[PDB]
């Protein structure tokens, strides 16, 4: 489900908040867990990092 994919990636993000950049291997593992493509996983984390630092 979409909520499952979102919660997988959010959990990874908050466990890696000081280095929120998945390696190529970690992207493949996340793609498998979420059912998303590698490209979609990377897009999600690009957006997450942008949103985190976005001005209040």
């Amino acid at each position: 489900f979409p909520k499952v994919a979102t919660n997988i990636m959010r959990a990874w993000l908050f466990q890696h908040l000081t280095h929120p950049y998945p390696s190529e291997e970690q992207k493949k593992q996340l793609a498998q867990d979420t059912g998303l493509t590698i490209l979609q996983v990377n897009n999600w984390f690009i957006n997450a990092r942008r949103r985190i630092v976005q001005p209040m």
Side-chain angles (χ1 to χ4, degrees):
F1 259 49
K3 287 160 186 266
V4 171
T6 295
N7 286 344
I8 284 283
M9 286 186 295
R10 288 178 64 87
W12 191 98
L13 177 66
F14 289 119
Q15 290 182 81
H16 298 85
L17 203 55
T18 58
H19 183 69
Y21 303 92
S23 69
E24 295 311 305
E25 177 56 41
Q26 290 168 319
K27 289 177 191 171
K28 184 173 183 178
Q29 297 169 336
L30 290 169
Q32 185 175 52
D33 278 7
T34 63
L36 301 177
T37 63
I38 292 296
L39 175 59
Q40 289 164 347
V41 170
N42 196 64
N43 286 346
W44 191 95
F45 278 93
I46 293 173
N47 182 69
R49 292 189 295 268
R50 290 174 178 171
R51 298 314 189 76
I52 283 171
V53 306
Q54 78 201 322
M56 28 245 59

